[PDB]
Amino acid sequence: QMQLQESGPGLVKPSETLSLTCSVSGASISDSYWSWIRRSPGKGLEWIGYVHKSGDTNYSPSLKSRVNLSLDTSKNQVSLSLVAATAADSGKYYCARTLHGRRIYGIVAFNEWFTYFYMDVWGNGTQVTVSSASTKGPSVFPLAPSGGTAALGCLVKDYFPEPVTVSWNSGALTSGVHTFPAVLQSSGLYSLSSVVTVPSSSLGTQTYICNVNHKPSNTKVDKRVEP
Amino acid sequence: DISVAPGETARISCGEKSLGSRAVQWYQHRAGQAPSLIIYNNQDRPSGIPERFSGSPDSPFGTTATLTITSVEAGDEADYYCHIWDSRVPTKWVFGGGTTLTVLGQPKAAPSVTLFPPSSEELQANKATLVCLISDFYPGAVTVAWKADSSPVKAGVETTTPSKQSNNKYAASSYLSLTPEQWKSHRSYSCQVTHEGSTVEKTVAP
């Protein structure tokens, strides 16, 4: 079987070149065609292009002006280069071994046939987020809440990098506390929510304060949350 | 999007009506997994793919590419895309379809959903965020859809991958970045969480 893995050197800021590598194992790149695919949240699963040693190589009309696919025989790697990257180029990129066949529906001499390409081996894909994100402290907002239970929380918004810590009432309140993993936003900044489930009847008696700490920017915020 | 009971047969159509001779490929995409080739050249099957999966012939002209999966089983629960090659249509650079197949016979736990509106504090900062917190679901696969009033919203949506909770169920959160104007103008916003064929909805109004 063959294995493929898509990877970047790292972080892509707007108006920088996106450089991706597809490491191939268990086979040589010279025996096959190769394709790059991507899934941008703004759009669907799109074919970027394919490459081959013979010079049989084509790119998507929408990306042809910015993309370069290359073959590195020495390193057995398939390369993707995308100039002038923006948030619109964010998403997940796939490398795949591409096969081909001929759909012959008439006489070959009459050009009554065409070549089709299909991908039988895909990589897991790598995520690419284009941004100028740098060290930034979080903004903290209260998430306000008859009978039954109630969910009150704190929205820790737009920080970088990970991670942040959250407690309630300086650790006096740990029951029903659920801190969710942060989302990586198109801005390149992170956001997470910490919600504590409490009895509605308690809304008057007890006082609720979330304690947020973000080391990278030396930020400490205590946000009181009420209804 | 379709839901099928184990043993029953699934039918997924993809792409436009056919104009010339075709070579249709079908691809399977499970959550957080590499896609796979299930069908190529309309009906042909790569090694490993069982005869349960079958494709439609490229005749007659005007047909729609249909993928049939008989006697469905849990493993066949995934997104199904087709890549159509038509002798009379220009080469396609975006894969078609995207239909999700849910299999119904599985052990599971429905998600709990809490939706928060933007805080008055954030609004004073001229920004707005809807927070949809999803917890206690199993298996760990959900799809989140947002509704501004009655119309779907694609822009502004950020959704985390499911993460394992301490009680071995799953959690996830979806955020809708929104301008205060968008927030006030609309009658309401909805977070729609679909899990194993069933959707749970929460709505907040400014």
Ligand SMILES: *[C@@H]1O[C@H](CO[C@@H]2O[C@@H](C)[C@@H](O)[C@@H](O)[C@@H]2O)[C@@H](O[C@@H]2O[C@H](CO)[C@@H](O[C@@H]3O[C@H](CO[C@H]4O[C@H](CO)[C@@H](O)[C@H](O)[C@@H]4O[C@@H]4O[C@H](CO)[C@@H](O)[C@H](O)[C@H]4NC(C)=O)[C@@H](O)[C@H](O[C@H]4O[C@H](CO)[C@@H](O)[C@H](O)[C@@H]4O[C@@H]4O[C@H](CO)[C@@H](O[C@@H]5O[C@H](CO[C@]6(C(=O)O)C[C@H](O)[C@@H](NC(C)=O)[C@H]([C@H](O)[C@H](O)CO)O6)[C@H](O)[C@H](O)[C@H]5O)[C@H](O)[C@H]4NC(C)=O)[C@@H]3O)[C@H](O)[C@H]2NC(C)=O)[C@H](O)[C@H]1NC(C)=O
């Ligand atoms: C692409 O992709 C792919 C895939 O992916 C996947 O899937 C998909 C679908 C999705 O979902 C995603 O998400 C995923 O991921 C990939 O691949 C992959 O990879 C990965 C990586 O991560 C991996 O993962 C893994 O998983 C596992 C599981 O497995 C299974 O499952 C899965 C799913 O889930 C799959 O996938 C696989 O495959 C499998 O499956 C299976 O298969 C088989 C065969 O075929 C069959 O048969 C079966 O059935 C199946 N099944 C099913 C399907 O179900 C898991 O498990 C793991 O986990 C782990 O690890 C991690 C990291 O990584 C962590 O985080 C966690 O936590 C875990 O861990 C562990 O834990 C445990 C508990 O605690 C432990 O145990 C313990 O231990 C202790 C001890 O310790 C110690 C001490 O002492 O302290 C420590 C230390 O450190 C040490 N030291 C040393 C030096 O070592 C020590 C020593 O050892 C001495 O001895 C001392 O003792 O130790 C105690 O003992 C106690 O008692 C106990 O309890 C342990 O430790 C730990 N471990 C570690 C290692 O850490 C993981 O997660 C997977 O697997 C894969 N998959 C595959 C298929 O392959 C890839 O990668 C991609 N690709 C590319 C190219 O890139």
